[PDB]
Design a protein around this ligand. Structure first.
Ligand SMILES: [Cl-]
Ligand SMILES: [Cl-]
Ligand code: NA
Ligand code: NA
Length: 129
């Protein structure tokens, strides 16, 4: 599923991400835009052999099991394919574990390089929330 901007903002809000660990909703929408272009089926392979999955591009070296990343952890205890569903529940629950691990949203390179320090509230402007 390819989400609309306000559609995704509303779904993330219902799943408890607005101000989760202090990150306003606009941060999460901006990260999803530049990680996946709002497409739940996005995958990208990394140089080290791991793969990033779903709307928030969660990586198989640490967070999910895809059966082809040797020596990886599965800290969210989920198959990586569950992160590609049109239902974003599994991606959100895993993202909550990631953002709590010590480095905040800096774990998402695109957030650091394209959202951090910008006017992220613009990503939810005009939405009925
Ligand atoms: Cl915001
Ligand atoms: Cl980047
Ligand atoms: Na929309
Ligand atoms: Na893994």
């Amino acid at each position: 599923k390819v989400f609309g901007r306000c559609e995704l903002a509303a779904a993330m809000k219902r799943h408890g991400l607005d101000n989760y660990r202090g990150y306003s909703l606009g941060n999460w929408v901006c990260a999803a835009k530049f990680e996946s272009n709002f497409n739940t089926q996005a995958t990208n392979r990394n140089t080290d052999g791991s793969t990033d999955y779903g709307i928030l591009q969660i990586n198989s070296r640490w967070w999910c099991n895809d059966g082809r990343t040797p020596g990886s952890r599965n800290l969210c205890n989920i198959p990586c394919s569950a992160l590609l569903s049109s239902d974003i529940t599994a991606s959100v629950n895993c993202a909550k574990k990631i953002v709590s691990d010590g480095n905040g949203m800096n774990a998402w390179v695109a957030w650091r390089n394209r959202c951090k320090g910008t006017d992220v509230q613009a990503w939810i402007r005009g939405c009925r929330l």
